[PDB]
Design a binder for this molecule. Structure first.
Ligand SMILES: CC1(C)Nc2nc(N)[nH]c(=O)c2N=C1O
Ligand SMILES: CC1(C)Nc2nc(N)[nH]c(=O)c2N=C1O
Lengths: 160, 160
Protein backbone atom coordinates (compact mmCIF):
# COMPACT_ATOMS: atom_id res chain seq x y z
CA UNK A 1 0.00 0.00 0.00
CA UNK A 2 1.41 3.39 -0.98
CA UNK A 3 0.96 6.92 0.34
CA UNK A 4 0.13 9.29 -2.52
CA UNK A 5 -0.49 13.04 -2.60
CA UNK A 6 -3.12 14.58 -4.86
CA UNK A 7 -3.34 18.29 -5.74
CA UNK A 8 -6.82 19.76 -6.35
CA UNK A 9 -7.70 23.12 -7.87
CA UNK A 10 -10.77 24.92 -9.27
CA UNK A 11 -11.87 28.43 -10.15
CA UNK A 12 -15.19 27.82 -11.93
CA UNK A 13 -18.76 26.87 -10.96
CA UNK A 14 -18.46 27.04 -7.17
CA UNK A 15 -14.80 25.95 -6.55
CA UNK A 16 -15.31 24.94 -2.90
CA UNK A 17 -18.18 22.62 -3.92
CA UNK A 18 -16.12 21.15 -6.79
CA UNK A 19 -13.31 20.30 -4.30
CA UNK A 20 -15.74 18.76 -1.77
CA UNK A 21 -17.32 16.65 -4.50
CA UNK A 22 -13.90 15.52 -5.77
CA UNK A 23 -12.69 14.62 -2.25
CA UNK A 24 -15.85 12.59 -1.61
CA UNK A 25 -15.32 10.72 -4.90
CA UNK A 26 -11.60 10.08 -4.10
CA UNK A 27 -12.57 8.81 -0.62
CA UNK A 28 -14.95 6.25 -2.28
CA UNK A 29 -12.35 4.70 -4.63
CA UNK A 30 -11.82 0.95 -4.25
CA UNK A 31 -8.61 0.01 -2.44
CA UNK A 32 -8.02 3.61 -1.44
CA UNK A 33 -8.38 5.42 1.88
CA UNK A 34 -8.45 9.23 2.13
CA UNK A 35 -6.21 9.95 5.11
CA UNK A 36 -6.36 13.72 5.46
CA UNK A 37 -6.89 16.88 3.40
CA UNK A 38 -5.21 20.25 3.89
CA UNK A 39 -7.19 23.48 4.43
CA UNK A 40 -8.70 25.09 1.29
CA UNK A 41 -6.66 28.09 0.07
CA UNK A 42 -7.95 30.89 -2.17
CA UNK A 43 -5.03 31.86 -4.38
CA UNK A 44 -4.22 34.38 -7.12
CA UNK A 45 -4.37 32.78 -10.57
CA UNK A 46 -1.13 31.52 -12.12
CA UNK A 47 -1.71 32.56 -15.75
CA UNK A 48 -3.96 35.22 -17.37
CA UNK A 49 -5.18 37.52 -14.56
CA UNK A 50 -8.67 38.04 -15.95
CA UNK A 51 -10.02 34.83 -14.34
CA UNK A 52 -11.36 34.12 -10.86
CA UNK A 53 -9.05 33.27 -7.97
CA UNK A 54 -8.59 29.53 -7.45
CA UNK A 55 -9.47 27.34 -4.48
CA UNK A 56 -6.66 24.81 -3.85
CA UNK A 57 -5.97 21.84 -1.59
CA UNK A 58 -3.82 18.72 -1.32
CA UNK A 59 -5.17 15.34 -0.18
CA UNK A 60 -3.21 12.42 1.28
CA UNK A 61 -4.32 8.90 0.38
CA UNK A 62 -3.19 5.28 1.04
CA UNK A 63 -3.89 3.19 -2.01
CA UNK A 64 -3.21 -0.17 -3.60
CA UNK A 65 -4.09 1.16 -7.06
CA UNK A 66 -1.13 1.21 -9.49
CA UNK A 67 -0.06 4.66 -10.77
CA UNK A 68 -1.92 4.32 -14.09
CA UNK A 69 -5.08 2.94 -12.45
CA UNK A 70 -5.08 5.80 -9.95
CA UNK A 71 -4.74 8.20 -12.95
CA UNK A 72 -7.63 6.43 -14.75
CA UNK A 73 -9.79 6.86 -11.64
CA UNK A 74 -8.93 10.53 -11.17
CA UNK A 75 -9.73 11.20 -14.83
CA UNK A 76 -13.03 9.29 -14.41
CA UNK A 77 -13.88 11.50 -11.43
CA UNK A 78 -13.11 14.67 -13.46
CA UNK A 79 -15.28 13.34 -16.34
CA UNK A 80 -18.24 12.33 -14.17
CA UNK A 81 -17.98 15.69 -12.39
CA UNK A 82 -18.34 17.37 -15.79
CA UNK A 83 -14.86 18.99 -15.97
CA UNK A 84 -14.81 22.07 -18.19
CA UNK A 85 -11.73 24.18 -19.13
CA UNK A 86 -12.39 27.50 -20.93
CA UNK A 87 -8.86 28.18 -22.31
CA UNK A 88 -5.24 27.09 -21.76
CA UNK A 89 -3.95 28.55 -18.46
CA UNK A 90 -7.49 29.73 -17.82
CA UNK A 91 -10.74 28.75 -16.07
CA UNK A 92 -11.48 25.11 -15.14
CA UNK A 93 -14.11 23.56 -12.88
CA UNK A 94 -11.61 20.99 -11.51
CA UNK A 95 -8.08 19.61 -11.90
CA UNK A 96 -6.85 16.54 -9.95
CA UNK A 97 -3.08 15.91 -10.17
CA UNK A 98 -0.93 13.11 -8.71
CA UNK A 99 1.93 14.98 -7.00
CA UNK A 100 3.61 11.98 -5.37
CA UNK A 101 3.19 8.21 -5.50
CA UNK A 102 5.19 6.81 -2.61
CA UNK A 103 8.81 7.59 -3.31
CA UNK A 104 8.51 6.52 -6.90
CA UNK A 105 9.71 8.41 -9.92
CA UNK A 106 7.44 7.75 -12.89
CA UNK A 107 8.02 9.63 -16.10
CA UNK A 108 6.19 8.00 -19.05
CA UNK A 109 3.58 8.73 -21.76
CA UNK A 110 0.76 9.41 -19.29
CA UNK A 111 2.56 10.28 -16.02
CA UNK A 112 5.09 12.83 -14.77
CA UNK A 113 5.70 12.00 -11.09
CA UNK A 114 7.10 14.17 -9.58
CA UNK A 115 6.17 17.18 -11.76
CA UNK A 116 8.77 19.66 -10.54
CA UNK A 117 7.10 22.83 -11.75
CA UNK A 118 4.45 22.12 -9.13
CA UNK A 119 7.04 22.43 -6.38
CA UNK A 120 7.41 26.10 -7.45
CA UNK A 121 3.69 26.66 -6.90
CA UNK A 122 2.62 28.25 -3.63
CA UNK A 123 -0.85 26.68 -3.84
CA UNK A 124 0.71 23.23 -4.01
CA UNK A 125 3.61 23.45 -1.52
CA UNK A 126 1.94 25.38 1.29
CA UNK A 127 -1.03 22.91 1.56
CA UNK A 128 1.34 19.87 1.23
CA UNK A 129 3.54 21.24 4.06
CA UNK A 130 0.45 21.60 6.24
CA UNK A 131 -0.28 17.84 6.07
CA UNK A 132 3.26 16.45 5.67
CA UNK A 133 5.50 18.69 7.79
CA UNK A 134 8.74 16.66 7.52
CA UNK A 135 8.25 15.16 4.10
CA UNK A 136 11.33 14.34 2.02
CA UNK A 137 10.64 14.28 -1.76
CA UNK A 138 11.89 11.61 -4.27
CA UNK A 139 14.66 13.94 -5.50
CA UNK A 140 15.90 14.17 -1.86
CA UNK A 141 14.68 17.78 -1.26
CA UNK A 142 12.96 18.46 2.07
CA UNK A 143 9.55 20.13 2.36
CA UNK A 144 10.79 22.57 5.05
CA UNK A 145 13.25 24.02 2.53
CA UNK A 146 10.81 24.17 -0.37
CA UNK A 147 8.20 26.07 1.70
CA UNK A 148 10.70 28.88 2.57
CA UNK A 149 10.05 30.54 -0.77
CA UNK A 150 6.34 30.90 0.13
CA UNK A 151 6.69 32.24 3.68
CA UNK A 152 5.15 35.55 2.66
CA UNK A 153 2.33 34.14 0.49
CA UNK A 154 -0.92 36.08 0.41
CA UNK A 155 -3.29 33.09 0.02
CA UNK A 156 -6.45 33.11 2.12
CA UNK A 157 -7.04 30.03 4.27
CA UNK A 158 -10.81 29.48 3.92
CA UNK A 159 -13.28 28.00 6.39
CA UNK A 160 -14.74 25.47 5.22
CA UNK B 1 10.53 43.65 -35.77
CA UNK B 2 9.39 41.97 -32.58
CA UNK B 3 11.37 41.94 -29.32
CA UNK B 4 11.66 38.32 -28.05
CA UNK B 5 13.36 36.87 -24.95
CA UNK B 6 15.07 33.50 -25.01
CA UNK B 7 15.95 31.44 -21.91
CA UNK B 8 19.21 29.44 -22.05
CA UNK B 9 20.24 26.59 -19.81
CA UNK B 10 22.95 23.92 -19.70
CA UNK B 11 24.48 21.53 -17.14
CA UNK B 12 26.71 19.24 -19.27
CA UNK B 13 29.86 19.30 -21.37
CA UNK B 14 31.11 22.69 -20.12
CA UNK B 15 27.85 24.70 -19.63
CA UNK B 16 29.50 28.13 -19.95
CA UNK B 17 30.83 27.25 -23.43
CA UNK B 18 27.49 25.66 -24.48
CA UNK B 19 25.83 29.01 -23.68
CA UNK B 20 28.50 31.08 -25.54
CA UNK B 21 28.21 28.83 -28.59
CA UNK B 22 24.37 29.09 -28.46
CA UNK B 23 24.41 32.90 -28.12
CA UNK B 24 26.77 33.09 -31.05
CA UNK B 25 24.48 30.92 -33.16
CA UNK B 26 21.45 33.05 -32.18
CA UNK B 27 23.25 36.30 -33.06
CA UNK B 28 23.91 34.88 -36.55
CA UNK B 29 20.28 34.04 -37.42
CA UNK B 30 18.69 35.70 -40.47
CA UNK B 31 16.36 38.61 -39.75
CA UNK B 32 17.46 38.56 -36.16
CA UNK B 33 19.61 40.80 -33.99
CA UNK B 34 20.96 39.84 -30.54
CA UNK B 35 20.46 43.02 -28.44
CA UNK B 36 21.84 42.00 -24.99
CA UNK B 37 22.33 38.96 -22.79
CA UNK B 38 22.04 38.74 -19.03
CA UNK B 39 24.93 37.55 -16.84
CA UNK B 40 25.29 33.76 -16.49
CA UNK B 41 23.93 32.29 -13.27
CA UNK B 42 24.90 29.02 -11.64
CA UNK B 43 21.76 27.49 -10.09
CA UNK B 44 20.61 24.27 -8.31
CA UNK B 45 18.85 21.81 -10.62
CA UNK B 46 15.07 21.91 -10.85
CA UNK B 47 14.36 18.18 -10.90
CA UNK B 48 16.50 15.19 -9.81
CA UNK B 49 19.36 16.34 -7.60
CA UNK B 50 21.90 13.77 -8.93
CA UNK B 51 22.83 16.03 -11.91
CA UNK B 52 25.24 18.97 -12.16
CA UNK B 53 24.25 22.55 -11.29
CA UNK B 54 22.97 24.51 -14.30
CA UNK B 55 24.37 27.68 -15.91
CA UNK B 56 21.45 29.95 -16.97
CA UNK B 57 20.95 33.16 -18.93
CA UNK B 58 18.32 35.13 -20.85
CA UNK B 59 18.87 36.87 -24.19
CA UNK B 60 16.95 39.75 -25.78
CA UNK B 61 16.65 39.63 -29.56
CA UNK B 62 14.81 41.68 -32.21
CA UNK B 63 13.50 39.50 -35.02
CA UNK B 64 11.23 39.38 -38.05
CA UNK B 65 10.98 35.58 -37.93
CA UNK B 66 7.48 34.31 -37.12
CA UNK B 67 7.05 32.46 -33.78
CA UNK B 68 7.22 29.05 -35.47
CA UNK B 69 10.12 30.00 -37.77
CA UNK B 70 12.04 31.25 -34.70
CA UNK B 71 11.27 27.95 -32.94
CA UNK B 72 12.58 26.00 -35.97
CA UNK B 73 15.82 28.01 -35.90
CA UNK B 74 16.32 27.55 -32.18
CA UNK B 75 15.75 23.80 -32.54
CA UNK B 76 18.14 23.70 -35.51
CA UNK B 77 20.77 25.42 -33.30
CA UNK B 78 20.18 22.85 -30.55
CA UNK B 79 20.52 20.03 -33.08
CA UNK B 80 23.62 21.48 -34.75
CA UNK B 81 25.27 21.92 -31.35
CA UNK B 82 24.61 18.22 -30.68
CA UNK B 83 21.89 18.61 -28.02
CA UNK B 84 21.75 15.64 -25.68
CA UNK B 85 19.32 15.18 -22.79
CA UNK B 86 19.52 12.05 -20.63
CA UNK B 87 16.06 11.79 -19.10
CA UNK B 88 13.02 13.91 -18.30
CA UNK B 89 13.93 16.70 -15.89
CA UNK B 90 17.55 15.54 -16.20
CA UNK B 91 20.90 16.74 -17.54
CA UNK B 92 21.21 18.34 -20.97
CA UNK B 93 23.92 20.10 -22.98
CA UNK B 94 21.58 22.93 -24.07
CA UNK B 95 17.96 24.12 -23.86
CA UNK B 96 16.73 27.24 -25.74
CA UNK B 97 13.17 28.35 -24.89
CA UNK B 98 11.16 31.29 -26.28
CA UNK B 99 9.87 33.00 -23.14
CA UNK B 100 8.12 35.96 -24.78
CA UNK B 101 7.47 36.97 -28.38
CA UNK B 102 6.47 40.63 -28.26
CA UNK B 103 3.32 40.95 -26.17
CA UNK B 104 1.78 38.00 -27.98
CA UNK B 105 0.07 35.00 -26.42
CA UNK B 106 0.67 31.91 -28.52
CA UNK B 107 -0.64 28.58 -27.27
CA UNK B 108 -0.66 25.75 -29.81
CA UNK B 109 0.83 22.30 -30.38
CA UNK B 110 4.41 23.57 -30.66
CA UNK B 111 4.39 26.74 -28.60
CA UNK B 112 3.44 27.91 -25.13
CA UNK B 113 4.13 31.66 -24.89
CA UNK B 114 4.20 32.75 -22.17
CA UNK B 115 4.77 29.53 -20.23
CA UNK B 116 3.64 30.49 -16.74
CA UNK B 117 5.71 27.88 -14.93
CA UNK B 118 8.81 29.69 -16.14
CA UNK B 119 7.68 32.77 -14.16
CA UNK B 120 8.16 30.59 -11.07
CA UNK B 121 11.81 29.73 -11.90
CA UNK B 122 14.46 31.84 -10.17
CA UNK B 123 16.83 31.04 -13.04
CA UNK B 124 14.67 32.71 -15.64
CA UNK B 125 13.12 35.67 -13.82
CA UNK B 126 16.30 36.93 -12.11
CA UNK B 127 18.27 37.12 -15.38
CA UNK B 128 15.15 38.41 -17.25
CA UNK B 129 14.80 41.16 -14.67
CA UNK B 130 18.51 42.03 -15.09
CA UNK B 131 17.96 42.98 -18.73
CA UNK B 132 14.35 44.26 -18.64
CA UNK B 133 13.59 45.78 -15.27
CA UNK B 134 10.60 47.72 -16.68
CA UNK B 135 9.06 44.64 -18.35
CA UNK B 136 5.26 44.34 -18.33
CA UNK B 137 4.22 40.74 -19.10
CA UNK B 138 1.45 39.77 -21.61
CA UNK B 139 -1.00 39.16 -18.73
CA UNK B 140 -0.20 42.67 -17.45
CA UNK B 141 1.85 41.55 -14.45
CA UNK B 142 4.97 43.67 -13.89
CA UNK B 143 8.38 42.01 -13.63
CA UNK B 144 9.29 44.23 -10.62
CA UNK B 145 6.66 42.32 -8.68
CA UNK B 146 7.35 38.80 -10.01
CA UNK B 147 11.05 39.03 -9.07
CA UNK B 148 10.38 39.84 -5.36
CA UNK B 149 9.80 36.13 -4.70
CA UNK B 150 13.48 35.51 -5.67
CA UNK B 151 15.06 38.35 -3.67
CA UNK B 152 16.89 35.86 -1.40
CA UNK B 153 18.15 33.54 -4.17
CA UNK B 154 21.42 31.61 -3.75
CA UNK B 155 22.36 31.63 -7.46
CA UNK B 156 25.96 32.55 -8.20
CA UNK B 157 26.24 35.35 -10.73
CA UNK B 158 29.41 34.60 -12.71
CA UNK B 159 32.01 36.97 -14.24
CA UNK B 160 32.70 38.57 -16.83
C1 LIG C 1 -3.94 27.58 -15.01
C2 LIG C 1 -3.29 27.14 -13.69
C3 LIG C 1 -1.73 26.99 -13.82
N1 LIG C 1 -3.45 28.27 -12.72
C4 LIG C 1 -3.75 28.06 -11.39
N2 LIG C 1 -3.68 29.05 -10.52
C5 LIG C 1 -3.97 28.78 -9.20
N3 LIG C 1 -3.85 29.79 -8.30
N4 LIG C 1 -4.37 27.56 -8.77
C6 LIG C 1 -4.49 26.51 -9.61
O1 LIG C 1 -4.90 25.40 -9.24
C7 LIG C 1 -4.15 26.70 -10.99
N5 LIG C 1 -4.24 25.71 -11.83
C8 LIG C 1 -3.93 25.82 -13.18
O2 LIG C 1 -4.20 24.80 -13.88
C1 LIG D 1 15.24 19.95 -16.18
C2 LIG D 1 15.17 21.44 -15.97
C3 LIG D 1 13.74 21.97 -15.65
N1 LIG D 1 16.02 21.83 -14.82
C4 LIG D 1 16.77 23.01 -14.74
N2 LIG D 1 17.27 23.44 -13.57
C5 LIG D 1 17.99 24.61 -13.58
N3 LIG D 1 18.47 25.08 -12.40
N4 LIG D 1 18.24 25.31 -14.72
C6 LIG D 1 17.75 24.88 -15.93
O1 LIG D 1 17.98 25.48 -16.99
C7 LIG D 1 16.93 23.68 -16.02
N5 LIG D 1 16.41 23.24 -17.13
C8 LIG D 1 15.59 22.12 -17.24
O2 LIG D 1 15.18 21.69 -18.36
Amino acid sequence: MITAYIALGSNLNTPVEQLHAALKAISQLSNTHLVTTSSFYKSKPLGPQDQPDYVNAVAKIETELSPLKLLDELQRIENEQGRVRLRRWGERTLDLDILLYGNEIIQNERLTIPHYDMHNREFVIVPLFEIASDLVLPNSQIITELVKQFADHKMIKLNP
